[PDB]
């Protein structure tokens with residue numbers, strides 16, 4: 150039954166890589182359990198428009214006040230209570246996704262299960278940066294293919310695109326191979342991008358401007374390689390518009406980017422209704438955010454491998470107790486209610502740089 | 510010659526309405542002159558996505574450190590130096606516009622002149638909120654027609670659209686009449702909006718979602734009244750996309766929304782290349798912002814009246830020494846270099862919440 154949000158903590162941690170990454174956590178408390186989610190916004194607006202400064206101000210100043218001490222039927226009722234404010238999806242997503250965790254934990258059910266998923270393990274691939282040359286690329290790829298990863302994503306740029314791809318393809322003619330074009334191209338480059346076609350990529354991710362659909366639709370008419378949209382899809386209606394236009398045949402679905410789990414479900418179902426698959430994008434998440442991603446990835450139209458690879462690839466030590474490790478390109482769903490993972494509070498304390506508490 | 514930016518000041522004021530409005534200012538110092546601009550983002554994200562807290566943290570943590578101490582050839586070079594960041598156009602606009610004012614003042618030239626305009630005054634319109642009934646709407650319109658405004662804008666909403674427009678058009682068969690539909694309709698409302706057609710509105714402003722073009726395109730096919738786009742045109746390429754898709758035939762051009770004067774002139778030119786007019790939109794600006802708008806509005810494709818009405822209608826006392834007052838629907842361009850207006854520093858002091866100075 151119904152749940153009352155009694156308190157909320159905002160905990161910002163700084164986590165060393167292997168220089169650092171800031172992890173904003175929102176914890177909601179209620180009914181003697183808690184829900185946790187992780188912000189994916191950065192200090193500076195590099196991947197998208199939102200920033201830690203603005204999202205946290207929106208949380209303490211607007212969203213938290215609207216929900217604290219209040220009672221709700223479901224996470225959708227929580228999202229509904231955050232008014233008609235424009236944009237700020239990642240901020241909304243912190244509240245919404247923690248609400249999903251909290252709510253699932255009051256029922257004792259795994260998050261994935263509530264969202265309609267029934268996979269017990271999800272397929273994963275890896276994304277690789279730009280390497281120095283054709284052989285160093287192939288070497289780095291081989292390391293990962295020997296780990297069983299089910300898709301390889303290579304960054305590209307002008308004019309480092311056809312070469313990395315052709316080399317990787319010749320050594321490995323059967324792997325699922327993709328590229329991330331990183332919004333570094335123009336309709337001008339349609340000719341170069343078309344050269345990629347003979348290497349049977351599954352898609353080219355977001356080759357043009359990060360906020361565009363119309364030019365993608367045009368570029369898609371000019372090349373045979375499917376395009377995958379990322380930043381240009383921030384909602385189920387964007388997904389609809391993109392697919393009705395022909396701007397892509399694939400969507401990289403990042404839960405926090407679309408404002409959370411429910412909306413991600415809708416994105417997911419709109420894609421399926423068009424016969425377009427989704428796959429789960431990643432963003433250097435701690436185990437909190439990684440767990441949420443895995444649970445969402447259990448939905449059935451997640452038919453291409455996700456960037457939800459092993460935690461130990463990123464951190465010497467994660468913010469949770471449980472390991473999130475994939476073997477042979479498969480990441481098991483972490484057992485337990487909600488996310489199935491648990492904050493390691495002692496370790497979190499040694500890397501916390503800010504913490505605040507909010508009540509009604 | 511080139512200009513060095515030696516110092517910047519952020520001053521946030523709470524200026525009394527005729528409740529209160531928070532006015533964030535940026536002051537750029539160099540070559541013995543200064544350039545000033547006004548942020549239009551608000552505390553919470555209601556009109557668009559940016560907030561004062563995100564915007565200001567972006568200025569002091571990223572944009573100002575990038576330009577402080579650097580020497581530039583023109584305002585465009587200043588923009589390019591903030592280069593790689595996404596969205597946040599209003600925050601960007603504070604730097605770029607303050608830069609135009611400074612640049613212009615090192616040259617001794619009025620801002621509008623440098624942007625290519627040659628009007629000495631600009632036509633203004635008036636905006637009427639929702640009134641209680643038809644005759645109250647008509648009586649207010651009658652007042653404003655008599656004061657000499659050259660366009661009437663009626664705010665409409667579902668349940669209250671055809672009625673005020675019918676009544677108004679009936680009493681005033683020839684005036685330039687428009688409506689602001691304020692993103693409150695959906696495609697199911699096409700039949701009701703089509704009923705406005707027989708009243709010869711110059712346009713309906715952004716009836717559907719604030720970030721949409723594709724559905725507006727469809728709505729334009731079902732009714733004959735021209736659509737005017739607002740929040741969904743944030744760049745020159747958005748303008749092109751909107752006009753080419755037939756999402757509208759008019760653009761409400763707001764200088765800060767698109768990233769400042771350079772990009773606004775680009776929106777102005779893309780629109781002109783399609784033969785679509787633009788007009789100057791407003792956001793309850795102090796004299797700083799109003800003066801920038803008035804100078805942008807001197808450009809030749811601003812062929813419909815703008816929301817740069819008298820400052821006295823908004824403020825008991827303005828932040829500038831010069832009064833910006835329209836007479837018979839004509840606002841004079843303020844004389845002098847740059848924006849042609851000058852901060853009243855002692856008055857400003859009495860209304861300053863907060864100030865900060867940054868250097869190298």
Ligand SMILES: [Mg+2]
Pocket residue numbers: 329354379
């Ligand atoms: Mg990517």
Ligand SMILES: [Mg+2]
Pocket residue numbers: 689714761790
């Ligand atoms: Mg308007």
